[PDB]
Amino acid sequence: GLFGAIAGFIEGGWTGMIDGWYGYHHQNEQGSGYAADQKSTQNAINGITNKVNTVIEKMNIQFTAVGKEFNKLEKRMENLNKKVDDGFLDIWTYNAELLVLLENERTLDFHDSNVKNLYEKVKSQLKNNAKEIGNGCFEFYHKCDNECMESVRNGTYDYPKYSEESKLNR
């Protein structure tokens, strides 16, 4: 995809992460588990649902539309009416399908971007206190218990706190 993360350097999704679109899997002495990232998930649901509303707002209803009749000497008028009806129907069918195709592409790219930005955000907090091991995963050079893990997840990780112990290990 455009941002390289989904079906990209993070090769697959997680059926075990059931509470949002993006998030974290951790493994330490205390255990392992999944947790969605709540802020990016909530902002993305807000964006996607606004996008649906916007699409719907612009075309969602037609009022009464019934046929007209023409006598045997009104064939030009009958053809003119049919040209109008067919032509508007051509245009709205084109508009509807293309709006959905184009927005679908943008939606998938938006999710890819959100995963990429969450990855880079963690990367920039950990710096060289962890190593990039592939597939969206970091391996700490220090012990990172659940309080440490939560600080990564909520964007308050304290690099100086662990940097001496990391330095010794790498």
Ligand X SMILES: *[C@@H]1O[C@H](CO)[C@@H](O[C@@H]2O[C@H](CO)[C@@H](O[C@@H]3O[C@H](CO)[C@@H](O)[C@H](O)[C@@H]3O)[C@H](O)[C@H]2NC(C)=O)[C@H](O)[C@H]1NC(C)=O
Q: Name which of residues 66 to 105 contact a second copy (CB under 8 A).
A: 68-70, 76-77, 79-81, 83-84, 87-88, 91-92, 94-95, 97-99, 101-102, 105
Q: Pick from ligand X, other proteins, a second copy, none: which does 87 bind, CB < 5 to 8 A by kind?
A: a second copy
- Find all residues with CB under 8 Å of 135, minimum gap 6, and list them: 9, 10, 11
Q: Letter for the amino acid at 13?
A: G
Rounded to 10 degrees, the C-alpha dihedral 48/49/54/55 comes to 70
Our CB check for other proteins shows the closer of 135 and 156 to be 135
Looking at 86, 105, 120, 158, which residue binds ligand X (CB under 6 A)?
158
Q: How far is the CB of 92 from a second copy (least distance, A)?
A: 8
d(CA 108, CA 103): 9
Neighbours of 147 (CB within 10 A): 7
Binding partner selected for residue 12 from a second copy, other proteins, ligand X, none, CB under the kind-specific 5 to 8 Å limit:
other proteins
Query: In whole angstroms, what is the distance from residue 63 CA to residue 61 CA?
Result: 7
The single residue listed with the structure tokens 């000497």 is 73
Q: Structure tokens of 108? A: 């998938």
Binding region for a second copy (CB under 8 A): 2-4, 8-9, 54, 58-59, 68-70, 76-77, 79-81, 83-84, 87-88, 91-92, 94-95, 97-99, 101-102, 105-106, 109-110, 113, 116-117, 120-121, 124, 127, 132, 134
